Every structure is written in structure tokens, then in C-alpha cells.
Amino acid sequence: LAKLGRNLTAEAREGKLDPVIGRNKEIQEASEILSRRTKNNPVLVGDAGVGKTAVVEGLAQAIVNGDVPAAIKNKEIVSIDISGLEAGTQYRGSFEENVQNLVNEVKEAGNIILFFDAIHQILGAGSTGGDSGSKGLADILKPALSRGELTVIGATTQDEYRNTILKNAALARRFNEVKVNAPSAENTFKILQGIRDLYQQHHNVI
Amino acid sequence: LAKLGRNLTAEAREGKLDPVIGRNKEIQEASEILSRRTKNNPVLVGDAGVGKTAVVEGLAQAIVNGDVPAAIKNKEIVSIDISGLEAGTQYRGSFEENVQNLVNEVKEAGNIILFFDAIHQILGAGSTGGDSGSKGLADILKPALSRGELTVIGATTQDEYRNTILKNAALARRFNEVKVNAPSAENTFKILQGIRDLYQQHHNVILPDEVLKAAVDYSVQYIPQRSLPDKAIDLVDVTAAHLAAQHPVTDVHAVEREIETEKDKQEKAVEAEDFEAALNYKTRIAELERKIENHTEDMKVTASVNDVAESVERMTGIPVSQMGASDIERLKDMAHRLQDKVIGQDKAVEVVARAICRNRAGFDEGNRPIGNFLFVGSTGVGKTELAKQLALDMFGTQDAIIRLDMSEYSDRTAVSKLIGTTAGYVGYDDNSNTLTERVRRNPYSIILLDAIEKADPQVITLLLQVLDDGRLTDGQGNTVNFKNTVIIATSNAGFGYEANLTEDADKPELMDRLKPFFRPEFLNRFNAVIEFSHLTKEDLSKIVDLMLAEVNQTLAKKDIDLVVSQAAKDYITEEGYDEVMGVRPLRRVVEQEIRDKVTDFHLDHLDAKHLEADMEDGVLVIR
Amino acid sequence: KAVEVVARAICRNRAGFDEGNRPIGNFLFVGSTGVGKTELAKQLALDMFGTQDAIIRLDMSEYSDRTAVSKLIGTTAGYVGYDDNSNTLTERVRRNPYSIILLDAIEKADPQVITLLLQVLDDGRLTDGQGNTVNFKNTV
Numbered sequence: 021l022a023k024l025g026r027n028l029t030a031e032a033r034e035g036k037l038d039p040v041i042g043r044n045k046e047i048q049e050a051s052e053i054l055s056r057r058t059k060n061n062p063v064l065v066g067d068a069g070v071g072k073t074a075v076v077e078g079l080a081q082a083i084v085n086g087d088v089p090a091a092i093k094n095k096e097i098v099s100i101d102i103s104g105l106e107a108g109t110q111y112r113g114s115f116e117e118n119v120q121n122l123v124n125e126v127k128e129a130g131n132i133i134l135f136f137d138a139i140h141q142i143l144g145a146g147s148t149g150g151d152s153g154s155k156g157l158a159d160i161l162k163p164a165l166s167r168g169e170l171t172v173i174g175a176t177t178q179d180e181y182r183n184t185i186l187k188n189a190a191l192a193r194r195f196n197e198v199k200v201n202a203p204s205a206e207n208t209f210k211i212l213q214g215i216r217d218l219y220q221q222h223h224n225v226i
Numbered sequence: 227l228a229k230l231g232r233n234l235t236a237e238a239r240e241g242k243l244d245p246v247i248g249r250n251k252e253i254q255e256a257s258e259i260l261s262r263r264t265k266n267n268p269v270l271v272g273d274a275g276v277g278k279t280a281v282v283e284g285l286a287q288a289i290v291n292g293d294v295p296a297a298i299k300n301k302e303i304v305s306i307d308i309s310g311l312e313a314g315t316q317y318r319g320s321f322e323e324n325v326q327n328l329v330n331e332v333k334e335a336g337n338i339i340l341f342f343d344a345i346h347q348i349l350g351a352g353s354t355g356g357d358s359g360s361k362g363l364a365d366i367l368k369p370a371l372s373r374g375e376l377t378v379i380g381a382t383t384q385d386e387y388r389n390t391i392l393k394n395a396a397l398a399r400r401f402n403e404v405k406v407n408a409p410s411a412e413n414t415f416k417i418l419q420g421i422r423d424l425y426q427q428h429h430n431v432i433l434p435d436e437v438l439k440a441a442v443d444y445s446v447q448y449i450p451q452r453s454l455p456d457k458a459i460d461l462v463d464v465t466a467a468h469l470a471a472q473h474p475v476t477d478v479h480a481v482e483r484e485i486e487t488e489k490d491k492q493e494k495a496v497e498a499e500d501f502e503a504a505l506n507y508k509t510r511i512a513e514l515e516r517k518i519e520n521h522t523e524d525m526k527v528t529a530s531v532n533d534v535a536e537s538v539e540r541m542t543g544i545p546v547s548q549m550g551a552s553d554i555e556r557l558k559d560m561a562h563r564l565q566d567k568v569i570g571q572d573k574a575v576e577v578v579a580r581a582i583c584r585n586r587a588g589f590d591e592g593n594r595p596i597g598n599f600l601f602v603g604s605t606g607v608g609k610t611e612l613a614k615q616l617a618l619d620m621f622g623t624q625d626a627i628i629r630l631d632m633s634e635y636s637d638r639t640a641v642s643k644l645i646g647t648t649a650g651y652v653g654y655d656d657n658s659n660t661l662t663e664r665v666r667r668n669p670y671s672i673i674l675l676d677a678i679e680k681a682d683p684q685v686i687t688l689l690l691q692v693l694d695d696g697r698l699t700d701g702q703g704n705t706v707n708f709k710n711t712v713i714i715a716t717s718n719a720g721f722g723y724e725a726n727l728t729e730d731a732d733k734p735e736l737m738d739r740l741k742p743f744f745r746p747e748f749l750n751r752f753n754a755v756i757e758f759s760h761l762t763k764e765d766l767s768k769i770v771d772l773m774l775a776e777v778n779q780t781l782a783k784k785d786i787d788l789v790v791s792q793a794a795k796d797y798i799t800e801e802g803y804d805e806v807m808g809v810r811p812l813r814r815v816v817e818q819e820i821r822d823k824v825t826d827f828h829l830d831h832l833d834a835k836h837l838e839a840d841m842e843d844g845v846l847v848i849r
Numbered sequence: 850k851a852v853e854v855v856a857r858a859i860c861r862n863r864a865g866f867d868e869g870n871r872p873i874g875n876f877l878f879v880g881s882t883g884v885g886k887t888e889l890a891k892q893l894a895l896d897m898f899g900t901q902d903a904i905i906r907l908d909m910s911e912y913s914d915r916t917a918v919s920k921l922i923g924t925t926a927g928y929v930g931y932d933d934n935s936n937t938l939t940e941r942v943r944r945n946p947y948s949i950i951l952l953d954a955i956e957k958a959d960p961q962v963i964t965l966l967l968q969v970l971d972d973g974r975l976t977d978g979q980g981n982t983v984n985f986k987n988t989v
């Protein structure tokens with residue numbers, strides 16, 4: 021791995037990741053999509069600043085925990101710096117070759133699962149948004165997802181979803197959506213209690 | 227071979243391919259085209275999700291089987307990734323060289339036959355579709371097919387066919403078409419029975435036939451916007467995934483770790499040649515192993531029609547009373563279903579229900595749109611009732627309608643709500659992702675046109691194209707079908723209200739006025755017109771308790787129950803009986819007055835169960 | 850009266866009593882200028898948002914296009930175009946989905962923009978010049 025991305029499962033094994041709190045059904049409901057043979061591309065929808073990624077780290081935690089159903093026991097999750105992909109290369113033709121080389125890497129029993137955070141930044145390689153765009157997964161994914169090569173997970177906001185996703189019928193027959201909402205002022209209190217110790221850094225009252 | 231493609235015949239020899247079921251004539255009829263010396267390029271036409279490729283795999287199966295006529299005994303079939311062809315090369319000139327190198331490979335007695343799945347994706351290398359395209363077979367095939375070099379097979383959809391294929395005469399003198407249709411709910415049952423064993427994967431019940439036929443019967447009646455074979459499968463798939471019930475695996479995973487540790491210690495003892503300890507370790511390994519075996523078989527096997535039902539409910543958000551009811555039941559019960567969510571006006575209910583049943587049962591001859599109806603009256607009559615409740619009951623969601631208020635739609639004067647010319651408007655409809663884009667996306671949706679005397683455009687004839695046959699051309703010449711859509715348009719039937727003394731004076735008190743208002747020909751084109759003359763006082767208590775119901779529903783979010791006295795109801799009715807235009811003030815009088823009191827009562831310290839509202843001289847008093 | 854109405858409406862929206870899918874509040878104020886006509890534009894805005902800088906105001910009468918004079922250029926129709934494709938109306942409202950928008954003196958100009966507003970005035974979802982819909986749920 022370790023090419024413009026990070027293995028979250030590897031960190032999870034080490035215990036380097038904070039416990040995800042109060043997200044119970046919302047996380048494992050996600051498994052209810054992944055376990056299917058087709059129609060298996062869940063995206064988390066909601067506004068920013070809601071612990072959006074915290075769901076997927078909690079998913080990795082559960083996978084290590086043996087909480088998941090048997091369908092996804094043997095897989096791992098890698099998060100990808102979409103926005104910095106062109107940083108890894110000098111020429112965009114070489115860029116596209118490296119991009120397809122990812123699919124080339126994605127043959128290991130599907131044990132690799134790609135995660136992102138800006139789906140609109142994925143839907144490029146064309147005029148999916150704005151006036152133009154640089155080459156990206158779009159010109160490669162459209163078949164690959166149709167032919168079941170990949171499984172991606174999220175993630176984006178409400179308006180991005182209705183403006184970009186519901187317009188390409190190709191995604192319609194592969195993708196699914198999961199609602200995310202900010203919690204109440206009890207779980208927030210719990211999360212803050214969890215973080216509390218971090219700010220020993222500032223040599224003031226905890 | 228093995229260059230951006232796959233030999234299906236090779237897999238067929240190995241028995242790696244599933245048996246194709248129920249496609250008998252449709253497959254071997256294909257041979258009747260291939261056996262010819264010329265005119266030998268069959269393409270399969272039809273909608274997606276119908277087992278479109280399954281035909282060609284069945285053809286390969288038959289070829290191996292010796293079912294075919296002698297003409298094609300010695301050939302094989304290769305399927306090609308058209309869309310990924312540029313993936314195999316870096317430079318598109320090198321790409322074209324590789325493409326022609328395919329023809330170079332295609333010299334082996336014609337034993338190779340090319341198969342594809344996106345003919346429009348083949349017809350590239352030029353402006354055959356869209357604005358531009360990358361180089362492809364087009365600049366090479368056009369002669370090769372003319373000079374008989376290749377034989378290709380399919381495949382694409384109906385609209386692709388009429389829009390791209392019938393326009394190049396070169397293809398006309400080489401190509402042929404074969405119709406494909408989804409099968410009935412017996413062969414589908416067979417195919418599902420065949421697949422059934424695959425889902426041992428999910429360690430749940432392998433499903434009894436009753437659940438399967440129930441899934442078919444539900445998907446057919448609740449999701450018409452999809453083809454039968456795929457939707458029946460997907461329903462089962464999601465059903466199984468949910469029936470996994472999100473069970474964990476740690477309850478066996480921990481002992482897997484234990485077996486690993488014991489195995490390591492066993493290896494260590496074997497290193498030291500201490501055979502008693504290794505024997506004990508092996509015994510413990512067997513112990514834990516068959517324990518895990520026992521846990522593994524602790525799978526719940528419960529396929530229930532009910533579980534499929536909640537899966538459906540999650541699919542569409544619609545709880546279903548009387549699940550499994552016959553269509554005979556449903557087509558009559560929907561009469562009340564809409565009747566009891568609206569108030570009176572039973573004529574519209576009757577007309578709409580009968581028309582819907584005719585379309586659903588297939589009694590009416592095809593080649594006409596589903597329904598085209600006019601509704602003429604004032605606004606405050608629930609004028610949009612059939613836009614919301616009818617739409618939702620039809621489609622498991624009200625979000626199946628697009629509405630244009632045609633009067634305000636068009637262009638009248640250079641004011642900052644509308645820009646351009648009314649003529650410009652038709653242009654938008656015929657070249658831009660505003661009308662044609664959407665209708666082709668949801669060929670079952672409902673379109674609503676408000677108040678249509680009414681604007682600058684006298685668009686009667688432009689609609690007649692669909693109003694005759696549902697086929698209507700765009701600004702590029704492409705025709706869109708309107709077979710499965712509903713068109714509802716509205717108008718003004720005059721207005722009172724005194725209240726009911728002038729709600730309806732006579733039958734021609736309407737049409738004779740509408741004769742200078744609506745052109746008689748545009749009238750004669752419709753299935754029916756219905757009117758909204760309905761505004762009274764005795765039947766308005768029913769809407770009163772309807773809003774009271776939604777009020778308590780809203781309160782249910784905070785575990786609050788409100789009780790309303792009958793005298794309060796009478797006073798509210800009298801308040802809202804500004805019976806001059808409609809029922810908007812009827813909602814308005816409780817729009818804030820109830821919730822304003824609720825605001826202050828919520829500052830309590832409140833018995834949410836006890837809140838009962840009554841009337842003191844026109845003042846709301848709640849305890 | 851204005852204090853009463855505004856306070857009760859604000860409480861209803863804040864407490865969540867009113868059913869959703871409607872904008873926060875849509876109110877009309879009709880009178881002369883020298884009455885503190887902009888009082889609720891300044892003090893109400895500031896109390897609502899910890900700062901008065903939460904409002905965008907368009908004097909719709911002077912907003913539109915009437916005659917080729919050097920305070921306004923183009924056609925009144927052109928104006929709706931600006932609102933639906935340019936970083937003047939849709940840009941901003943999506944940036945501060947809680948902001949307050951004020952329309953001065955609205956008989957009043959060439960445009961009879963009643964229906965174009967009804968889209969929000971019904972449900973707060975309103976399309977742009979590109980087809981994108983913007984929500985107006987949390988605005989006044």
C-alpha cells in the first residue's frame with residue numbers, strides 16, 4: 021500500500037485510533053450494504069463537522085473487533101488522498117497510468133476497500149462539475165464500478181449528493197446512501213470527556 | 227486471444243457457465259441470421275436488466291452442445307471490453323494500430339466472432355453521438371462490415387437502436403435486429419430457484435419457494451419502474467443481507483485466536499520432541515475446532531414473507547396494510563385509499579381509478595400515454611390533492627411528479643422573474659437538460675401543468691404528438707416515448723364563493739365560457755376533464771380533524787398529546803368559514819393559534835398527556 | 850404587534866413546533882420610512898445572530914431595470930439571470946443558509962416577481978440557472 025494513502029486497518033490493529041462513541045447502528049448498518057453481491061457502494065450523507073469520518077474509523081475498529089458479519093472479515097480499508105493524487109506524478113498521462121495501476125493493485129481478493137472524503141473531487145476527468153476538470157477515476161471507474169471491480173465508501177454532503185450523484189444513472193444502479201445526523205447533548209458530553217485529557221498539553225486545568 | 231477480452235467458448239467447454247433458462251427460440255433464432263452468407267449481423271434489442279447477455283452465453287452453451295445448425299459449428303465467440311480499449315495503450319495512434327491489429331487477428335477462418343454490449347460506444351471515432359468521440363472501430367468497421375470482414379453481435383437498447391443504427395444506411399444493408407422481452411413469473415421463479423444455492427454465502431436460510439414467489443409478487447406490483455428479472459433478484463439479495471441481522475463474529479473469533487495460540491505452543495513442544503504435550507495440544511485443537519463448528523451451524527433459518535415486506539418498506543418508505551392482497555383487492559381498495567385522504571369529489575376518484583385499472587390490467591390498447599386529464603376549478607379545493615396523494619399511492623412516494631405552472635412558465639415581459647422570449651422556452655424543452663433529460667430518466671413519472679389557458683403560448687399542437695402516440699421529437703431529432711407517463715393539467719372554472727350558491731350554476735356555465743378559453747380541439751384530446759366546484763361548511767369538519775390528526779402527529783415528536791373539544795371544533799370551523807375562495811384560512815386559523823398556546827404551555831412543567839383544548843368566548847383554553 | 854408576531858414565530862421555529870419543509874419566516878411590513886422602518890433589520894438581526902451583519906437587502910423597486918440611465922444597465926429580465934447564474938444571490942445564500950434577506954418596497958418595480966418566489970415560499974427549494982436547487986430552510 022503506502023502510495024498516496026493510508027491503511028486504517030493497520031493503525032487499528034495497533035490500537036492507535038480513538039474509540040468511536042455513540043454511533044452504534046449507523047456504523048454497522050453500513051455492513052448491511054457491503055455484504056451484498058451487488059448494489060454495494062454506500063456513501064455517508066450529511067453536513068460537515070459531524071464526525072463524518074469517525075464512522076469509518078469506527079467501522080475499522082469493529083472489523084478488528086470481530087463485530088462485523090462474516091461477509092467482510094478478510095478485508096481491509098485504505099483511505100486515499102484524492103486531492104493530492106497529481107502530487108505523486110509529473111505528467112497527467114503518467115498520472116492516469118498510475119491511476120489504472122491502482123486497479124491493477126486492486127485484485128487481492130477485494131481485501132482492499134477504497135475510502136475517500138470528496139466524491140465530487142472524484143467525479144472529475146470531465147465536466148461533471150464546473151467548466152472542466154483534470155483526469156481522474158471517472159474515466160476508469162464508470163466501467164469498473166459497473167463491472168463490480170471496486171467497492172468505495174463515501175463521502176460527501178447533502179447538496180453534493182443531489183446535484184452530482186442522482187444525475188448519472190450508472191451510479192444509480194450501484195450506489196446507496198446512509199443518513200448521518202449530529203448527536204444530542206449527552207453523547208457530545210461523552211466525546212468531550214474522552215478528549216479531555218489531550219489538553220494537558222496546555223498546562224492548564226483539565 | 228486474451229487481449230482486452232475473453233473467450234466465452236473456452237469457459238463453456240469447461241462447464242464454468244450457468245445454464246441459460248427459458249430462452250429457447252430467442253437464442254437459436256439468432257442462428258437463423260448467422261447462417262447467411264450476407265446480411266448476418268444480428269443485434270439484440272430491448273431494455274436493460276432482462277438477461278440481455280444471458281442470451282449470448284446460452285448461444286455459446288448450445289454451440290458446445292451441438293444444438294446449432296452446421297453453419298457455425300467451427301466458430302468461437304469472444305467478448306470485448308470496448309470501453310476499456312484505450313486502457314491497453316498509451317497513444318491513440320498506437321490505439322488505432324492495435325485496433326486494426328484486431329482485424330489482422332480476425333483472419334482465422336472467421337472462427338472468431340466479436341461480441342459487445344454497447345453499440346453506441348462502438349459507433350465512435352466521430353460525431354455519431356454527442357459532440358465528439360475518440361477513435362474506434364467506426365473508421366475501420368464501416369468498410370470491413372461492408373466488405374464482410376467481421377460478424378458482430380449486439381447489443382443495446384430500443385432508443386439507442388432507433389437513434390443511432392437506423393441513420394447510417396451502411397449498417398442498414400448489413401444489420402438485423404432481434405426483439406428481447408422479460409419473461410413471466412414462472413421462468414423467473416425457475417431462474418431464482420437455480421441461483422438459490424449461491425446465497426449459502428451469507429450463512430442464512432436458503433429460501434423456501436413461498437418466500438421467493440412472495441418476493442416476485444411484491445416487486446412486480448410495487449416497483450414497476452424496473453424490469454422483472456433484476457428487481458426480483460435484488461429484492462432477495464437485500465432481504466438476505468438484512469436477515470444477517472448484523473450479527474457479530476467475535477463469539478467464534480476469540481476461539482480462533484485461542485486455536486492459534488495453542489497451535490503455536492504445539493509447534494514449540496514438537497520442536498522439543500515432547501510427544502505427550504503435542505498430543506494433548508492436538509486433542510485441545512480438535513476440541514476447540516468442533517466447538518467452532520457447532521457455533522458456525524448456529525445460524526437462524528427464517529425466511530418469512532413478512533421480513534421481505536419490511537425490506538420493501540425500507541425500500542420505498544411505504545407501510546403496507548393488507549400485505550399480499552390480490553391486485554383485485556388493491557384496485558378496488560385504492561378507491562377508498564384516495565377517497566378517504568380527500569373529501570368528496572367522488573367523480574375524479576371514479577375516473578382516475580378506472581383509468582388506472584385499465585392501464586394496469588392492460589385492457590386498453592397500447593401506443594397511447596397512460597392518462598391525460600384536465601382539472602378545472604379554484605385553488606383552495608385541495609387542487610393539488612391528486613398531485614400529492616395520488617402520486618404517492620401510484621409510486622410509493624410523492625416524489626414522482628414534475629410540475630410546471632405554464633402561465634408563469636412562459637415569457638411575457640422583461641421582468642426579473644423571466645428572461646428572453648416565450649419562443650425561447652420551447653427551445654429549452656427540446657435541447658437542454660430540463661424536460662427531455664428528466665422524462666427519459668423516469669419514464670413513469672407524472673407531469674403537471676398548472677393553469678394552462680393561460681400564458682403567451684397556445685401550445686396545443688406541439689403536445690398532440692404525445693397526445694396521439696407518446697413519441698415526440700427533440701431539438702436534435704431524437705424521439706422520446708411517453709408511454710408510461712401521466713399528464714395532468716389544470717385550469718380555472720370560475721370562482722365564488724357565496725359560498726355554494728354560485729359554486730356551480732349549470733353545466734354549460736363552464737364549457738361555454740371555456741370555449742373561448744380552451745380550444746375545443748384541445749378539449750377533445752383528453753381522456754377526461756373534472757372540475758373543482760367544491761367549497762361548503764358541513765363537510766369541512768372532516769378536514770378539521772385531519773389537521774387535528776397532523777397536529778397531534780407533530781406533537782408526538784415531543785411525547786405530547788393534545789385533546790380538542792367538539793365546541794372548539796365548531797368555533798374553528800366558524801372562524802375558517804370565510805367561505806369565499808377556499809380552505810386556506812381553514813388551515814390558517816390553527817396555523818399558529820394552537821401552537822402559540824402550546825408554546826407557553828411547553829414552558830411548563832407540563833402533563834403532556836392532559837392537554838385538552840376548549841373554547842371560552844372565542845379564546846383557546848387548554849388544561 | 851410586530852414584536853408579538855416576530856417573537857412567537859421565532860419561538861415556534863426555535864422550539865421546533867412548526868413542521869419543517871418551510872422557510873423560517875416570511876413577513877411583510879408596510880408603512881412610511883421615518884418610523885424606524887429598518888429597526889427590525891438592525892436590532893432583530895443582531896439579537897438573532899450576535900451581529901447585525903447577517904442581512905442582505907435589495908430595494909427591489911430600484912433593483913430592477915427601468916430606463917437606460919446611468920444607475921442601471923440592461924433589461925429587467927437580465928436581472929433574474931444575474932440571480933440564477935452569478936455570484937450575487939445564490940452564491941451568498943448558500944454561504945450563510947441562516948442569513949436574513951430584506952426586499953424594500955416591493956410593489957414596486959417592473960418585475961411582478963410573485964411566482965418565482967413561490968418555490969421557496971412553498972418549500973424553500975428553488976432551482977438556479979444551472980438546475981441546482983438551493984434550500985432556504987433556515988433563512989428569513
Ligand SMILES: Nc1ncnc2c1ncn2[C@@H]1O[C@H](COP(=O)(O)OP(=O)(O)OP(O)(O)=S)[C@@H](O)[C@H]1O
Pocket residue numbers: 038039040041042043067068069070071072073074075211
Ligand atoms: N463519536 C466520536 N468520537 C470521537 N470523536 C468524535 C466523534 N464524532 C466526532 N468526533 C470528532 O469530530 C471530528 C469531526 O471530523 P469528521 O467530521 O469525522 O471529519 P473531519 O475531517 O474531521 O471534518 P469534517 O466534519 O469531515 S468536514 C472528528 O475528527 C473527531 O475528532
Ligand SMILES: Nc1ncnc2c1ncn2[C@@H]1O[C@H](COP(=O)(O)OP(=O)(O)OP(O)(O)=S)[C@@H](O)[C@H]1O
Pocket residue numbers: 244245246247248249273274275276277278279280281417455456
Ligand atoms: N435465463 C436466465 N438464467 C439465469 N440467469 C439469468 C437469466 N436471465 C437473466 N439472468 C440473470 O440476470 C442478469 C441480467 O444481466 P444481463 O441483462 O444479461 O446483462 P448484465 O450485464 O447483467 O446487465 P444488463 O441487463 O445487460 S444492463 C444476468 O447477468 C443473470 O445473472
Ligand SMILES: Nc1ncnc2c1ncn2[C@@H]1O[C@H](COP(=O)(O)OP(=O)(O)OP(O)(O)=S)[C@@H](O)[C@H]1O
Pocket residue numbers: 567568569570571604605606607608609610611760769809810
Ligand atoms: N375534496 C376537498 N375539498 C377541499 N379541500 C380539500 C379536499 N381534499 C383535500 N383538501 C384540502 O385542501 C387543501 C388545499 O390547500 P393547499 O394545501 O394550500 O393546496 P392549494 O393551495 O389548493 O394548491 P394551490 O397551489 O393553491 S392550486 C389541502 O390542504 C387539502 O388537504
Ligand SMILES: Nc1ncnc2c1ncn2[C@@H]1O[C@H](COP(=O)(O)OP(=O)(O)OP(O)(O)=S)[C@@H](O)[C@H]1O
Pocket residue numbers: 881882883884885886887888
Ligand atoms: N417605533 C418606532 N417608531 C418610530 N421611530 C422609531 C421606532 N423605533 C425606532 N425608531 C427610530 O426611527 C429611526 C428611523 O430613521 P432612520 O434611522 O433614518 O431609518 P429609516 O430612514 O426609517 O429607514 P429607511 O431607509 O428610510 S426605510 C431610527 O433611528 C430608529 O431608532
Ligand SMILES: [Mg+2]
Pocket residue numbers: 071072073074
Ligand atoms: Mg474527518
Ligand SMILES: [Mg+2]
Pocket residue numbers: 277278279280
Ligand atoms: Mg450481462
Ligand SMILES: [Mg+2]
Pocket residue numbers: 605606607608609610611
Ligand atoms: Mg391545490
Ligand SMILES: [Mg+2]
Pocket residue numbers: 882883884885886887888
Ligand atoms: Mg426605516
